[PDB]
Amino acid sequence: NNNLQRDAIAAAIDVLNEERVIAYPTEAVFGVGCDPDSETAVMRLLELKQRPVDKGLILIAANYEQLKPYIDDTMLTDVQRETIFSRWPGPVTFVFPAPATTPRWLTGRFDSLAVRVTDHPLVVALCQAYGKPLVSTSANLSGLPPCRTVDEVRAQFGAAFPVVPGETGGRLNPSEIRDALTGELFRQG
Numbered sequence: 556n557n558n559l560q561r562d563a564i565a566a567a568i569d570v571l572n573e574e575r576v577i578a579y580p581t582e583a584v585f586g587v588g589c590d591p592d593s594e595t596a597v598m599r600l601l602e603l604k605q606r607p608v609d610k611g612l613i614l615i616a617a618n619y620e621q622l623k624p625y626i627d628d629t630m631l632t633d634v635q636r637e638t639i640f641s642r643w644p645g646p647v648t649f650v651f652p653a654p655a656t657t658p659r660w661l662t663g664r665f666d667s668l669a670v671r672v673t674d675h676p677l678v679v680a681l682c683q684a685y686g687k688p689l690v691s692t693s694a695n696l697s698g699l700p701p702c703r704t705v706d707e708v709r710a711q712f713g714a715a716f717p718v719v720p721g722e723t724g725g726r727l728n729p730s731e732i733r734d735a736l737t738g739e740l741f742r743q744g
Contacts, residue, residue, distance in 0.1 A: 563680035565716050571685070575599065578708050578718040579615070579691055580676045582646065583726050585702055588615065588689040596690055597660055603697040609664040613648050613691045613732065616672045617682035625670070626651040630735070645672040649735035669732045677719045 566577050574595040579588030589596050591614060601608045616622060630651060653668040662668060682689050694701040702708045705720040
């Protein structure tokens with residue numbers, strides 16, 4: 556309990572100052588994340604990745620406080636809250652038409668940003684702590700093995716702090732990125 560709280564806080568402040576990427580819980584396969592609105596994210600991606608920069612990974616939020624000014628308020632409405640709140644917190648990512656006013660280095664590809672909201676794991680504590688989302692990236696590098704579990708990054712770096720220990724049942728990939736513009740299913744028959 557207390558240790559977990561410290562772990563979340565440690566990751567938030569550490570990355571804030573250290574400016575990098577740390578282990579992030581995933582609703583499917585272990586991944587890593589960082590602090591939104593930061594030069595390190597764009598640079599660290601373009602660094603070893605150099606390609607997905609335009610696509611722009613998926614970001615995880617814990618509070619709607621950041622979904623309210625990050626998307627037009629026309630999409631969002633009392634029924635939307637109820638519906639998203641009454642229909643799972645967010646098991647799938649949706650791409651909303653980000654505002655033109657905002658920069659373009661966040662996607663630079665097209666006017667649509669894929670984001671997801673989750674409220675149940677240690678993610679909140681980490682996001683809530685920072686008071687803002689956590690960018691979500693896949694657990695991989697240029698050629699360095701991934702992080703099957705926190706036991707990995709640990710044997711790998713000795714974290715045991717800048718990490719969010721845990722586990723998951725085991726699923727293929729039910730979480731995807733749908734066009735929030737229509738929200739239509741994949742099947743057409």
